[PDB]
Design a protein around this ligand. Structure first.
Ligand SMILES: [Ca+2]
Length: 265
């Protein structure tokens, strides 16, 4: 697989949609899609505390990819953002194989189709930042990686990654016995970590459509992704991105301004 090197194309932002309102998707500000805001699941992240009726404060099903262990204390709320930090606790404090901590939130709600959007300021540190959706339930396990990137590794500053996975699917839902995925990366003309950007997903029975700052950059025929999914926000380690801890570069912040969810009227 060539996706460590291959930019399929570049993404042009000269005609990118202007922000007109905070009521509809950035890629559809005039609401041609007939969207309705999901007020249960959407979060503007105001205040100083997690809404723990809406979110789990860590990941109950995954401790983390070594060497980074998900912890509740790494996620705080400041100036209208969820803020995720990375720490190195004292030696011996974490379970075997783990040396650093990162934050993780999982939605208590499950979703099937709709528009999903998050405004994100990446951490400038060698941890992947993630806004993605997944579910592992009754031997059906699928995942949509709206945003899985690590510009905090300077070699990756101009990459925009995307992927979708089927880890397993029963006979009547795709019949997948071996993990399959479909990664694709694109060139972006700015360094991803410098500013907030808006990731969008228009997920329908027919297509997965992915948007960056309102610009469509990938379309996927929706063959397999018909399973309800939870929303995940987190930092993690991943050797593939060169996303391994750096004790001299771990003081950055992953900022989530909002998560917005819409359904069809
Ligand atoms: Ca906010």
């Amino acid at each position: 697989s060539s996706h460590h090197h291959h930019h399929h194309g570049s993404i042009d932002f000269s005609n990118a949609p202007k922000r007109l309102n905070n009521k509809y998707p950035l890629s559809d500000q005039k609401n041609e899609g007939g969207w309705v805001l999901n007020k249960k699941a959407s979060d503007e992240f105001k205040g100083k505390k997690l809404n723990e009726e809406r979110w789990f404060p860590n990941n109950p099903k995954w401790k983390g990819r070594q060497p980074t262990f998900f912890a509740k204390e790494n996620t705080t709320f400041e100036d209208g953002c969820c803020v995720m930090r990375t720490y190195k606790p004292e030696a011996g404090s974490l379970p075997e194989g783990y040396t650093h901590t990162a934050g993780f939130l999982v939605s208590k709600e499950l979703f099937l189709y709709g528009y999903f959007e998050a405004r994100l300021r990446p951490n400038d540190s060698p941890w992947v930042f993630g806004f993605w959706m997944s579910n592992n339930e009754r031997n059906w396990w699928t995942e949509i990686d709206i945003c899985e990137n690590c510009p905090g590794n300077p070699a990756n500053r101009h990459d925009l990654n995307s992927n979708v996975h089927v880890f397993k699917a029963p006979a009547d839902k795709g019949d997948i016995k071996k993990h399959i995925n479909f990664p694709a990366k694109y060139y972006i003309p700015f360094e991803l970590q410098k500013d907030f950007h808006v990731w969008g997903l228009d997920w329908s029975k027919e297509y997965i459509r992915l948007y960056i700052d309102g610009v469509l950059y990938r379309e996927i025929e929706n063959k397999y992704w018909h399973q309800p999914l939870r929303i995940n926000l987190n930092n993690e380690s991943n050797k593939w991105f060169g996303a391994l801890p750096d004790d001299n570069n771990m003081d950055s912040e992953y900022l989530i301004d909002y998560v917005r969810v819409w359904y069809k009227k």
